[PDB]
Structures are given as C-alpha cells and as structure tokens.
C-alpha cells in the first residue's frame, strides 16, 4: 500500500494478495468453509453457476460489505484485495 504498490501497477505485475473478479452477473452464494470461503455466483443467464472455491478469511470482502443475496455486475471485485490487472 504505497511506493511498491504504485511500481506494482505500472509494472503490470500479479498483485501480492489476490482478489477474485466476478465472471459473469447474478446472485451470489456464499459459504464459509473451515477457515476458508466459497462464493458461487448463480447468474441472472440461467447458465452455470461459477463458483469461487477458496479465498482466505484474511482477505474479508469488497464494501456494503458482501451478503448472500446481493446481487454482482461482471467487473465488480470480491473480496478485498488488488485485482489481477490481466484479470479485468
């Protein structure tokens, strides 16, 4: 979160903690695993559910804050953290 992050961006590198992008739109299905999250968003398509199998708990969610329920444009980031700029 300063100078090396800004040379991180310019440098089109993959972020140090990751962060998942929505795929597609739609609700979302979220679960919490043993120390672990699952998110599955279930698409406002009717196609396949993608889902988002392992992300930390450390990592938290995008703000507000996630629930299950809320509804995902595509390029809405997840959980909190630096997108992968070859992601978008």
Same mark, same amino acid.
């Given at each position: ?6 040379? $991180?961006?310019? @440098? ?5 903690? !990751?962060?998942? #992008? ?8 979220? $679960?919490?695993?043993? !120390?672990?999250?699952? #998110?599955? #968003? ?5 196609? $396949?559910? /993608?889902?988002?199998? !392992?992300?930390? !708990?450390?990592?938290?969610?995008? /703000? ?8 995902? @444009? ?12 070859? $992601?978008?």
């Amino acid at each position: 979160g300063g100078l090396p992050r800004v040379q $991180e961006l310019f @440098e089109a590198r993959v972020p140090r903690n !990751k962060a998942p #992008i929505a795929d597609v739109a739609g609700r979302v299905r979220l $679960e919490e695993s043993d !120390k672990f999250f699952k #998110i599955t #968003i279930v698409p406002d398509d009717g196609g $396949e559910e /993608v889902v988002y199998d !392992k992300l930390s !708990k450390r990592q938290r969610l995008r /703000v507000g804050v996630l629930s299950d329920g809320d509804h995902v @444009e595509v390029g809405d980031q997840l959980m909190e953290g630096a997108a992968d700029p070859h $992601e978008v």
